Symmetry: C4
Subunit: 387 residues, 4 copies
Amino acid sequence: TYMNNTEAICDAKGFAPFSKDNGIRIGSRGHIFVIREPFVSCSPIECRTFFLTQGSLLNDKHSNGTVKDRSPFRTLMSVEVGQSPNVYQARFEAVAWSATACHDGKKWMTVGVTGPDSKAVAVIHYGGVPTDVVNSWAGDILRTQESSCTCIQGDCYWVMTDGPANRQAQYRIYKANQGRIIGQTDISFNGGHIEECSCYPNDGKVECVCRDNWTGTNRPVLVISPDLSYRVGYLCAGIPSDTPRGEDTQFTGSCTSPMGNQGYGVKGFGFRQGTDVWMGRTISRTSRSGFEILRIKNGWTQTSKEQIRKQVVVDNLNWSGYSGSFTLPVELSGKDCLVPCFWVEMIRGKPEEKTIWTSSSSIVMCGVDYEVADWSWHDGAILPFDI
Amino acid sequence: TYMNNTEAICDAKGFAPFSKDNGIRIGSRGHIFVIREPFVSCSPIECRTFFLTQGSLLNDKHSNGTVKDRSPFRTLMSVEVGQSPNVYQARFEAVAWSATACHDGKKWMTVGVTGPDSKAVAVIHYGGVPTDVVNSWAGDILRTQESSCTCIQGDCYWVMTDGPANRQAQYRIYKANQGRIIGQTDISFNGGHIEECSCYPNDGKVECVCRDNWTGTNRPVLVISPDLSYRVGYLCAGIPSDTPRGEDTQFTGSCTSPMGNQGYGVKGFGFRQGTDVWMGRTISRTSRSGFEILRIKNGWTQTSKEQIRKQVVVDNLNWSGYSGSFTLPVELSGKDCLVPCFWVEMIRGKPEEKTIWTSSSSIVMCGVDYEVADWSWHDGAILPFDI
Amino acid sequence: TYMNNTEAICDAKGFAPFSKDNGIRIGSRGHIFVIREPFVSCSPIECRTFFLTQGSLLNDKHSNGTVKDRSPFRTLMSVEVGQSPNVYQARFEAVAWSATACHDGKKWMTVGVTGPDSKAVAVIHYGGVPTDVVNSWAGDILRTQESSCTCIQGDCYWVMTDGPANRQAQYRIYKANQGRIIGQTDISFNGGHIEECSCYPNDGKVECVCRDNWTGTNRPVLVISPDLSYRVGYLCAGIPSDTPRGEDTQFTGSCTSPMGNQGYGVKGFGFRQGTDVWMGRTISRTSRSGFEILRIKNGWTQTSKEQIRKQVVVDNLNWSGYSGSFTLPVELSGKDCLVPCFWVEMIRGKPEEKTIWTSSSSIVMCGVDYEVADWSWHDGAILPFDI
Amino acid sequence: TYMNNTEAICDAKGFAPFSKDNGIRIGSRGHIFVIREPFVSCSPIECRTFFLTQGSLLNDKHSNGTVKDRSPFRTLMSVEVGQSPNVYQARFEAVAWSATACHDGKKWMTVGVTGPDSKAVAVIHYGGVPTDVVNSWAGDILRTQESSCTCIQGDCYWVMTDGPANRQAQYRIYKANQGRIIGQTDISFNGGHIEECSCYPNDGKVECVCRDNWTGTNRPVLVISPDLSYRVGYLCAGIPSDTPRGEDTQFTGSCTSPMGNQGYGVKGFGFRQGTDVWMGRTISRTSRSGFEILRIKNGWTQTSKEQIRKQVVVDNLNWSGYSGSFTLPVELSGKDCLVPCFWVEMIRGKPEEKTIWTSSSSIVMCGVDYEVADWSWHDGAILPFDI
Ligand SMILES: CC(=O)N[C@@H]1[C@@H](O)C(C/C=C/c2ccc(C)cc2)=C(C(=O)O)O[C@H]1C(O)[C@H](O)CO
Ligand SMILES: CC(=O)N[C@@H]1[C@@H](O)C(C/C=C/c2ccc(C)cc2)=C(C(=O)O)O[C@H]1C(O)[C@H](O)CO
Ligand SMILES: CC(=O)N[C@@H]1[C@@H](O)C(C/C=C/c2ccc(C)cc2)=C(C(=O)O)O[C@H]1C(O)[C@H](O)CO
Ligand SMILES: CC(=O)N[C@@H]1[C@@H](O)C(C/C=C/c2ccc(C)cc2)=C(C(=O)O)O[C@H]1C(O)[C@H](O)CO
């Protein structure tokens, strides 16, 4: 039975801790992969944490980290949400140095991209077996969400980018059923730049808040119809949520176009709340440290800078990183709307650390109809390690 | 199908060993969490040992134990009853530095409390996903049973405390269905103090024997109706079962009010046997060492000090600690009454030990229609460790 | 659905390797329990290796082995046949320093005996939960098979001994359903001594070949009816199969009475083949080394010393030990008779070894309608270990 | 429900990465078996990697590798495709120093061969239990595919060799149902030599591309009917695919007979594509390094040397080794043809390496209707190890 993810995103006042893996603390003595991008997606029965590994373990010479991001050993695997990415619990998912995964109600579909920059291949997996493929269409590091993809009534949608990391690149929407690609679209966005989309379902369409690594410190937004017709632009709120970025004051709200001089960014997320938006951002405007989440009134649809809520989850004395969106299956939340959730990656080691290695632990938050107090559920690991 | 836990508690003569995890002996070389409160609850299919971890492993720098009880890394996880709390077998349950868990017949519901003392949040999980929330209602370390909660015909009940550890605090009963809070009550108990309740079902109501950390060396008792109306008071028996506590002689039996001067205590349990009670207590009146279990005639309903049975399970040359109650699903025991069971936590390391670290192993006992001989199934670990 | 184990034992010509765990070789670097008695029993779906642990791991101070056989930390756990007894795969079964287990077709029933020598308790588990009990009835180290017990049409039978290890002791047959004891019998056997029975089903009755630790170098045999009426005596074959024991020549075949002067013995097994018997024995008449299996014509029913087959499985340059019987569920073998199988324990370390520790690996053989060549599938471990 | 593997092999243009285990990199700190022959077969629900172990772990004295190939400790076990052969995830399969495995749609059947060279036994397992046997029929290291065997409509077929490794030997086809041998054939092939067959299903028959260790640098091919009547010969393509071997030029294409002087070889594979063939081979003509896969027009049926496609998967600066074939169940690929897949073993340590030990990691590729770019997904391990 397929998942109906046609409902509205629940209107949440605040966010409660879902899980914490303590991966890096644990891996000081145990056998934990050195990972990145601990993103989360849910089947109708359980949620899982997907992650990329370098095939190495914490506290081992192979965590040496001079190793390349897009290496032949990079792989997507997964554990149950909250469990650390240890070797024993781990489920192999795909050969990938960039990935997205989502479950459609029947089986999991994942997408690993691997091979060479000039002609990468992205393998689609369905039920733990390759079913289809996409080749670099522009010859420049083909890549995708690094966050849950989105399944609406049996068909799954995700977004990919093939092109330069700075200047103008190319962007497409893909649509699969049972692991077979059945539709695709080019996304026109001159001046605009899209990467590492954080997507969720809403009112029967797919909404993403992505990353502009070229020109904007506000985040791109697109909204995908099931016919692959789409709207695209920026998150209207007059508050910048990329990293790095400038003061909110020094700031302009653009539904239309990138806003700040800054290049570069980090993966982030945001949830549409009617007209308001829950936006996430690092606390530091310059480094990936601390993590908070602001609610802005009419932020989805206007250049608003009216904060209704500020909720800290990682304090600014602590490292954060990537963040992403995902929804709770109705068939678990019990609710009648789609409970919005998100994960926060917390990175330790290089570059900000004395260590030969770099990994991250995660922490997951969900929905909830109440204000939740500010706290920091930071990583915790005592660096450096035996090495 | 929901669990009918409406039956009577079986009338047991003695207690047989259910399981022993040997966690700490095992963790001298293996990868075992450093835990506390190894409590037990049962689904209609298996029993599990829940525990709080600090995200660290035995024999690792992170077991350093200068780390705080209510840390951001504290989590509830679980294994099958008898298995050690090792990293590989472990199932993530919740972000919690205080917890209760119970299964209702369909799925597990757990409750982790985390965040800051002044405004903690308690997240309710159902089927391994947050479904609801409770915020500190009195701003003073919100907390709960540290032992199995109680599900009667689809609805689960547990008890929480928000307030000072010594003086007067506040106490409430909560009632959930399918992970949704559907009722709550304030518990009036001036002069009285309640913490770490050990609860089981009986005659369709919920009976707990809790901890008074203020004023009494006898244990509070409450009895909850499914309408959240309740009786509350003390365990009548004229024998003290808190720790620390005075001689049984020097002692008075109060159904009504706290009895000894002593402040402080430890989590304990007791089972109503018609009018008699099975009460547990440490052997040492002063330290948490040794563990025995006495049956007192008319102890539930009178200031009785008539011992029918004394049964040792941990000898007084050995460390004990927390203890708690839980019931065996009829759908496993095969019986027509609810077989009473309990766990005994055995603590090693700080403060009574030379070590940088503190954890505990457990041992579980059940029901049974026979006198069982005295023995000690103590922890066993050879301290200190490689460190 | 219960198991019908009413069929005849298949008439097998030879024995094929089923599994080898390599536990001790593996545990030189991995996390393997230090075990004894790796016996095997089968559900209608899989076979498992049960074992007693001391709660310790190989290559760890706790394997120190000055620790007592009947310690408070001794436990029965289990893995899938062929897997090593590692900590991660292990399933907790019971608190036991002596045990038997069998599956009846619906669930597993195990029996762990623990507590003090003068008043041990034997806990019966059904579906992984205690359901019943037996107390020492003679106050002298209550004990049982250390090998698969036997389930015939929903009811399971095993044998226990309470008494001295040398001189005359006491012996009983027990009969359970769904973990509830429903019948028991005293076994009259003056002059005779019974221990560590290896039992299998056959023609609707239960046949065992046990251990005489008092007076006989031939093995006791009993045959249990479902009404707990029984025949008992010795294995007629005119060849001794206990260890230690004398030359086969220097030997007499007694259906009736113990045969050689020797005291002591080891756990062994044998399968009735119409009138013939497959008997197992160590190769060395004096030490537990090497292991072979002889077929003797009319050995079940006569003082025969006619060898039809000799098949070596462990050569006499290698350590062996306990051995035991078990049957393959028809619902797996596919056959119409019960395929006879047996396990051989191979012991390393103390007393015959330089080491602080003692454990064993195993190797399992089955049925088969063909002569299988002689070989040695010995333990393999390179002693001593890092220590 | 049995598997219908009667369909045609899909016509694939190129091959996409399925999985990579990173076993050896991972085993630098974790607990990974030292293995060989990481072959792959699929049930209707999941694919698994089977492997032979020596019972030892990487970075342990027992990996010492002076140990013999056909040792008493050699065993077949298995994990989910992509997972490393670690001790915790591992499923015991059989006592084997040579093996094949295939699933028929209901259960897995495996075949381990063990015992002595002069009279080896091959045990057939069905549903994880021995069901049948084959003894050395020629007294000279009985052996088999080391790759997936083949199940067509409930009946499984594989090929075995009993005889010399060089000169003429003997070859047979076996046919089992539910683990019971129900047919066998001798394969007449004078001048010809067959070993380590890589087989898949196609048009309702079984096609293999095997290894000639005697005389030919082209690969033997046979095609088995369900009646065990067969055709046999060589792969016609005028290009040599054994290792070692000579230039393609210096080369002749023989459908009939072995082609080059060279003795010796390595296990390899090939897929019939109508009349064309996908053939695999090491890049180095002399050593087992690098791995590519060529498509040759009319190569199945003619002495053709027309390359349509060359696709590298391991570059010639890196070690390769054994390779083998397997099919994707329709009941997973979703397609209407059988998607051809293959695994490549990558060997590290002795003989080409400074180390006391030898193991291999693997990498798996599948079907796909597109050209996939050249890359190298080589092993990755940093030799030598702590030792
Ligand atoms: C496919 C791919 O390259 N995607 C990139 C992804 O890998 C990461 C993540 C890094 C993991 C990592 C780990 C250890 C070290 C020492 C260094 C890096 C980042 C990032 O911004 O952090 O950027 C993506 C990217 O380049 C941009 O989007 C611009 O196009
Ligand atoms: C939420 C919370 O704080 N609950 C407390 C709970 O954590 C523990 C257990 C301790 C684990 C631990 C472990 C290592 C070390 C070095 C120190 C402590 C105890 C206890 O009495 O032992 O008391 C609860 C408590 O404070 C009282 O009930 C009074 O209100
Ligand atoms: C309940 C109980 O004591 N059963 C005994 C059982 O434990 C064992 C097995 C020993 C394991 C072990 C391991 C490490 C060391 C250093 C020493 C011993 C043996 C045996 O004959 O080997 O004998 C049973 C027995 O005493 C007799 O049947 C006579 O009555
Ligand atoms: C049953 C059996 O012996 N089959 C052989 C098989 O074992 C292997 C694989 C070796 C594993 C290995 C591992 C570590 C070391 C130090 C040495 C070897 C090879 C091979 O060609 O590589 O050849 C098979 C063979 O002899 C031929 O087909 C000729 O008949």
